[PDB]
Design a protein around this ligand. Structure first.
Ligand code: GNP
Ligand code: 6L8
Ligand code: MG
Lengths: 1011, 208, 123
């Protein structure tokens, strides 16, 4: 309605109308809320709204209105303070101070308007950052003094000090210049002796919990930076570790304080400070045992119940114990009078480790890793923790998370859908600790596992969960036992797991136990390599599971097969005793039967595993014969499908034919992936007809686009035809990236390839171009680019301009072409730079445009390569020396790269590339200050050094782009920046100082003398 | 039984896409920066009754920040969002958290690392620890694949209602009506349907 | 829950879309189990579909005999059809739906069951 009236500043501000807009926004809904929101934003953003701030704080009845008024002052203080006349600055200060004093002395306002007082405190801290201590050196004395006049004021002064400490020490790195951060840090350091007095007095005095909690909250911040003596040379550790642990109001913050105290590294040679570090830990653990919970308490149940703040307290306790013990447990390990304290602390951690809470388990597990790694190396330590470690073996074995390989899950035992990567890292961490624990006592670990197993056979503890967690634990400790103990151990586990399969014979049953046996056996290849008779049986059993109707078991059997093959492949190529032929022979002969019930993706994995085996045969003649045997089925289907495609080239209309072709190529891709350079004979068998097929399917796609429109590219038919092209490109890329005979690559493969792919890419409409063409060409250039200078030129001509036109209208369309495009330019620039030298001057300008275009992407893939291309290009030009092309390059493009780099450095939208942007800028600047540009960069009096002109160019560029800077700021900045162009670290700090200063008015130019 | 939830994080981390997925079930591929804040009600059915979140989906881009921390007033819970493919968005998590808890000093907060569906992950799991000292719950999530997409709201609902055994429950399904098509516009849904028939469905390479 | 007076004639995993005619784009509405439910009292068969983890209703409507499953130009494993009375979001709205399945065999089986259900509702 008339809510917009408050946006008009001709008249005075209708405070009541303002409060209605605010209430409509916070308490409203729907369209009125949405309109009030826009109005309030416009109101806040008005460069004069700050003048209305004090009359809103005087006459408003809505605390949110006053909050928004303070946000308006904050914006003014942090960005425009030094542009205000000095009188407006004192008025704002006095008003903010008075409003704070006024709100504290009204005991009712102090209770109910907490947010509004916190916001005012923060606003006051913003004024301190600008004015303190140089223009207010009595703030801290007056704050200390005023703390006695009232309890509410004293409590609120702790909030102000807390916020100041945060703004100066914790959050200054990004918000202030180096010089100003150091100024305020030194200023607080110089006056902290007094602050600590007030803080320690309040803590010893002890008014009520409100003022104590606020004082401790501030102390937590101080502990980030204050000298050690304030903590160890006073009585404050006794207070923290006893007094304030007893009351639950102060226990949470005190524990966080003691955690911070713990994390410092003590002077490791003074006995007193050591005894004090022991003492506050001893006090803290005693207070927990007597006031909160004894060491026997069931923390798992307490956490699950989640009364009050129990969950946060247990989290904080875990953090305190792990933090302190990782730093200081050695202090407790020698003195026998401290052994109970040491073990009790670790017993609390054992209990914390049973809580059901993944993130909390990771925190304790991190600590256990720290401990067991230390007991694995440090002499004479592991016996101390024997009973702890024994309990920990149980905790980890019973809480193993499902490994990647186990594809069966319950929801009814069915098949996985997703990749749980939050669980991937967790499993790795559980495995690491359990492996260490097994090394520390291999007998205890076996006894736990064998007994738990013995109670699965009995059905005494049977369940999905118990057999699974146990099986995963058993698999995860592979490699910790000696071959002999492992031998006896695995035998026992397998025998007992087989017996269990016969007993729990439902279909869910058998799928659980099948997955567990597959996991275990897949984890013990060393055992398989030494027991061929068992290995053969396992493989045949996996082949049988390839016909399982349960899709999870079936898929897992294929993964276990290739996983075993990767480790045991050598035992499949040799002729074993008692065997009529290498087992690879037996696998190949029955491959159609074995894989008949598998999905195509699973068939390809099978073929890939056969390729791993075949590559172990180093007799070339025998290997190639294995290769042709393996490829018998796809090559026969290929020979059939190509004789029937050459004659009447229309049978490719058949969707069933297109699917058959794609699976043939996918099979070749699979085998090529594992055989690499050894694949070449098979590639040669299909290569010519495969590129002819590429051309034929290309004509079909173009014909369909012409007859049906661009929408044809979405149809199942055209998508299937493009799959053929993409897989062909993938096969050629896969081989070339592993090829060892590059002469054959150049003389046999490259020319037919380019003839088949480049013009087709160039002359298709954009929506029909395959970005995989670019990816294939990147590999070609990477591996043989140096041998095909004319082929690289041909690649550029065919794909450069037409791809650029696809991606230079926005940052979003054709995202895959975008990424592959700049990967291609990158490799060409670094391996065949000559191709860019032969470019026509107009096309070389598009190349520069293309690089700078990459700069402005937010997509990290494009941005990083763009910055790298620019840096490699500059290097490429510098390497040419003093010749016309280099000289013309600098004249035409040097200042384009400097200004484009500066633009992305300063626009606040490309923070992620700061490091590379700075590197590129430092290189560019260093070119001039090393006189490595042998031509004037200008068109200015003659004889001027390029150094002088660069400073003039940059000063003028910055003056016009950031007109709120003074001439002296710009000049000081450039002076510091140019002097530092050989010291990347300091150079970067100076750029960061500049990015701070451009966000405010009145920045001090001497800040750039910091280094 | 409604709770104010503020959602904060760097621009482009997927806050609005995440809420929209929960509102309508859709996945919005386009990035349209939020301007200030967008408020949407969001109800979940639980074994303890319906719980309603008033989701204040705030802007992450500074140039669109609007009232900034003014949005946080009276929030009863929050989600802090970052993007596991953008390290800078994790490095800013402590800044968002600072500004949030200065206004809301004692509320349940979930930290969410979004976009775990993308293969080239940059913020490794092992380096995500900011939540430990700050008592935040953490989840890997993907608004695109729905990985863990419900867990931030399930956890928040448990903390707000005070029942750790709270679970989502199937909403009852009323009998649907028996409506015959309209012959007055029967000659018209030839057009609206033809358009829909010839507009290709998105993401045809997905498992579903 | 309001479903125990019903028999499950057919169940399949699916992803359901709704056509936004204004933006000329399909928009995902939910992924989960698509069920054909026959009311034991009235013998009327309906589609009922719930999202995977929130279990929220994303489809609830009679399999009317006047509906016809059409193909989508981009897929061999989806069906498009117009719905006049769907109460998943509350008030019976009209929608143009598309439902996609994991395979062409699932989509075809769905069409078979969808047409059988139409005969049952033809009574
Ligand atoms: N691959 C992927 N992309 C996602 C995911 N979630 C969101 N996105 C994408 O991230 C981009 C940003 O979308 P958006 O939800 O608006 O992020 P935002 O944080 O709300 N932006 P702002 O804070 O500026 O308003 C979109 O392109 C979206 O498709 C995801 O889970 N996976
Ligand atoms: N008695 C059985 O064979 C049961 C138990 N059982 C299940 N899997 C196995 C089983 C599984 C494997 C495998 F790791 F390779 F997969 C190996 C062997 C072995 F040791 F014989 F070499 C047996 N045994 C069965 C259960 N479910 C599906 N198939 C078989
Ligand atoms: Mg948004």
């Amino acid at each position: 309605g008339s809510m917009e009236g408050i946006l008009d500043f001709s008249n005075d501000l209708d405070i009541a109308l303002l409060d209605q807009v605010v209430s409509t926004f916070y308490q409203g809904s729907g369209v009125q809320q949405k309109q009030a929101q826009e109005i309030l934003t416009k109101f806040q953003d008005n460069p004069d709204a700050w003048q209305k701030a004090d009359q809103i704080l005087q006459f408003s009845t809505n605390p949110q209105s006053k909050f928004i008024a303070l946000s308006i002052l904050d914006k003014l203080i942090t960005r425009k303070w030094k542009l205000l006349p000095n009188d407006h600055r004192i008025g704002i200060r006095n008003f903010v101070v008075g409003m704070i004093i006024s709100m504290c002395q009204d005991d009712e306002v102090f209770k109910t308007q907490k947010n509004l007082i916190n916001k005012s405190d923060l606003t006051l801290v913003q004024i301190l950052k600008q004015e303190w201590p140089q223009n207010w050196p009595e703030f801290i004395p007056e704050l200390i003094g005023s703390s006695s006049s009232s309890v509410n004021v004293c409590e609120n002064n702790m909030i102000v000090l807390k916020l100041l400490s945060e703004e100066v020490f914790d959050f200054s790195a990004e918000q202030m210049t180096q010089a100003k951060a150091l100024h305020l840090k030194n200023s607080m350091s110089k006056e902290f002796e007094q602050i600590f007095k007030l803080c320690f007095q309040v803590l010893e005095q002890g008014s009520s919990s409100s003022l104590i909690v606020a004082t401790l909250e501030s102390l937590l911040r101080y502990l980030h930076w204050i000298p050690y003596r304030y903590i160890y040379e006073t009585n404050i550790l006794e207070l923290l570790s006893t007094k304030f642990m007893t009351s639950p109001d102060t226990r949470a913050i005190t524990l966080k304080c003691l955690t911070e105290v713990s994390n410092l590294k003590i002077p490791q040679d003074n006995d007193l400070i050591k005894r004090q570090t022991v003492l506050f830990f001893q006090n803290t653990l005693q207070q927990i045992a007597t006031s909160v919970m004894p060491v026997t308490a069931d923390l798992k149940a307490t956490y699950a119940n989640a009364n009050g703040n129990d969950q946060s307290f247990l989290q904080d306790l875990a953090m305190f114990l792990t933090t302190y013990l990782a730093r200081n447990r050695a202090l407790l390990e020698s003195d026998e009078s401290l052994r109970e304290l040491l073990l009790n602390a670790h017993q609390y951690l054992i209990q914390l480790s049973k809580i059901e809470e993944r993130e909390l388990f990771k925190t304790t597990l991190d600590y256990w890793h720290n401990l067991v790694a230390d007991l694995f190396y440090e002499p004479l330590k592991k016996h101390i923790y024997e009973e702890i470690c024994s309990q920990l073996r149980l905790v980890i074995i019973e809480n193993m998370v499902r490994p990647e390989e186990v594809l069966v899950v319950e929801n009814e035992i069915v098949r996985e859908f997703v990749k749980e990567s939050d669980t991937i890292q967790l499993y790795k961490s559980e495995r690491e600790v359990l492996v260490y624990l097994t090394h520390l006592n291999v007998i205890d670990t076996e006894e736990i596992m064998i007994s738990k197993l013995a109670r699965q056979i009995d059905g005494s503890e049977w369940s999905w969960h118990n057999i699974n967690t146990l099986s995963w634990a058993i698999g995860s400790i592979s490699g910790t036992m000696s071959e002999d103990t492992e031998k006896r151990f695995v035998v026992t586990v397998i025998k007992d797991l087989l017996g269990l399969c016969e007993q729990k014979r439902g279909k869910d049953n058998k799928a659980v136990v099948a997955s567990d046996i597959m996991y275990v056996v897949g984890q013990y290849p060393r055992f398989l390599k030494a027991h061929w008779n068992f290995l053969r049986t396992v493989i045949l059993k996996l082949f049988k599971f390839m016909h399982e109707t349960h899709e999870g078991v079936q898929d897992m059997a294929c993964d276990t097969f290739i996983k075993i093959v990767q480790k045991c492949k050598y035992h499949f190529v040799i002729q074993q005793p008692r065997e009529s032929e290498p087992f690879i022979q037996t696998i190949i002969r029955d491959i159609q039967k074995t894989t008949a019930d598998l999905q195509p993706q699973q068939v390809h994995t099978f073929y890939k595993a056969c390729g791993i085996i075949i590559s172990e045969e180093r007799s070339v003649a025998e290997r190639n014969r294995l290769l042709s045997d393996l490829m018998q089925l796809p090559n026969m289907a290929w020979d059939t499908i190509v004789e029937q495609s050459t004659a009447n080239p229309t049978l490719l209309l058949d969707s069933e034919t297109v699917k058959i072709i794609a699976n043939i190529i996918k099979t070749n891709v699979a085998v090529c992936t594992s055989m690499g350079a050894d694949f070449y004979p098979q590639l040669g068998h299909i290569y010519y007809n495969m590129l002819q097929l590429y051309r034929a399917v290309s004509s079909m796609i173009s014909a369909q686009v012409a007859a049906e429109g661009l929408i044809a590219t979405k149809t199942p038919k055209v998508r299937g035809l493009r799959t053929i092209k993409k897989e062909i490109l993938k096969l050629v890329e896969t081989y070339i990236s592993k090829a060892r005979n590059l002469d054959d690559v150049v003389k046999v493969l490259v020319e037919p390839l380019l003839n088949a792919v480049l013009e087709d890419y160039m002359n298709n409409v954009p929506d029909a171009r395959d970005a995989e063409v670019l990816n294939c060409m990147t590999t070609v250039v990477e591996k043989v680019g140096h041998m095909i200078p004319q082929g690289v030129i041909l690649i550029l001509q065919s794909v450069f301009e037409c791809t650029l036109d696809m991606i230079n209208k926005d940052f979003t369309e054709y995202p895959e072409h975008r990424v592959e495009f700049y990967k291609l330019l990158k490799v060409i620039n670094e391996k065949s730079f000559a191709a860019f030298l032969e470019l026509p001057p107009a096309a070389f300008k598009l190349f520069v445009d293309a690089i700078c275009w990459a700069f402005k992407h937010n997509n990290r893939d494009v941005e990083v390569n763009g910055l790298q291309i620019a840096l490699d290009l500059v290097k490429n030009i510098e390497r040419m020396g003093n010749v016309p092309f280099a000289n013309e390059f600098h004249k035409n493009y040097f200042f384009i790269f400097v200004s484009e780099t500066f633009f992305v450095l300063t626009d606040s939208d490309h923070k992620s590339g700061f490091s590379k942007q700075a590197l590129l800028l430092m290189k560019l600047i260093s070119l001039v200050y090393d006189n490595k540009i042998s031509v004037p960069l200008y068109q200015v009096p003659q004889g001027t050094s390029n150094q002088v002109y660069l400073s003039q160019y940059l000063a003028n560029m910055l003056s016009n782009a950031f007109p709120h800077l003074t001439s002296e700021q710009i000049a000081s900045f450039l002076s510091a920046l140019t002097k530092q162009c050989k010291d990347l670290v300091v150079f970067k700090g100076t750029l960061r100082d500049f990015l701070v200063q451009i966000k405010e008015v009145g920045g001090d130019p001497t800040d750039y003398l910091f280094a | 039984v409604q709770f104010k939830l503020v959602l904060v994080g760097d621009g482009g981390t997927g806050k609005t896409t995440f809420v929209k997925r929960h509102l309508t079930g859709e996945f919005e591929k386009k990035y349209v920066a939020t301007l200030g804040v967008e408020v949407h009600p969001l109800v979940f059915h639980t074994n303890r009754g319906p719980i309603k979140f008033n989701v204040w989906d705030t802007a992450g881009q500074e140039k669109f920040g609007g009232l900034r921390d003014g949005y946080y007033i009276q929030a009863q819970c929050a989600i802090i969002m970052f993007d596991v493919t953008s390290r800078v968005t994790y490095k800013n998590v402590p800044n968002w958290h600072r500004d949030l808890v200065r206004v809301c000093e004692n509320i349940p907060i979930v930290l969410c690392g979004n976009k775990v569906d993308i293969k080239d992950r940059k913020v490794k799991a092992k380096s995500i620890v900011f939540h430990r000292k700050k008592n935040l719950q953490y989840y890997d999530i993907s608004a695109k694949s729905n990985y863990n997409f419900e867990k931030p709201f399930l956890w928040l609902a448990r903390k707000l209602i005070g029942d750790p055994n709270l679970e989502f429950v199937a909403m009852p399904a009323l009998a649907p009506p028996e409506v015959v098509m309209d012959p007055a516009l029967a000659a018209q849904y030839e057009h609206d349907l033809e358009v829909a028939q010839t507009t290709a469905l998105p993401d045809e390479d997905d498992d579903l | 829950t309001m479903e125990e007076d019903e028999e499950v004639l057919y169940k399949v995993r699916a992803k359901l879309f709704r056509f936004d005619a204004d933006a000329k784009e399909w928009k995902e509405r939910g992924t989960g189990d698509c069920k054909f439910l026959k009311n034991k009292k009235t013998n009327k068969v309906r589609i009922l579909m719930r999202r995977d983890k929130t279990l929220k209703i994303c489809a609830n409507h009679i399999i009317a005999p006047e509906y016809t499953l059409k193909p989508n130009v981009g897929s061999d494993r989806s069906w498009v059809y117009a719905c006049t009375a769907d109460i998943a979001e509350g008030e019976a709205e009209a929608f143009t739906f598309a439902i996609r399945f994991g395979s062409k065999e699932n989509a075809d089986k769905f069409k078979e069951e969808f047409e059988k259900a139409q005969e049952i509702n033809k009574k």
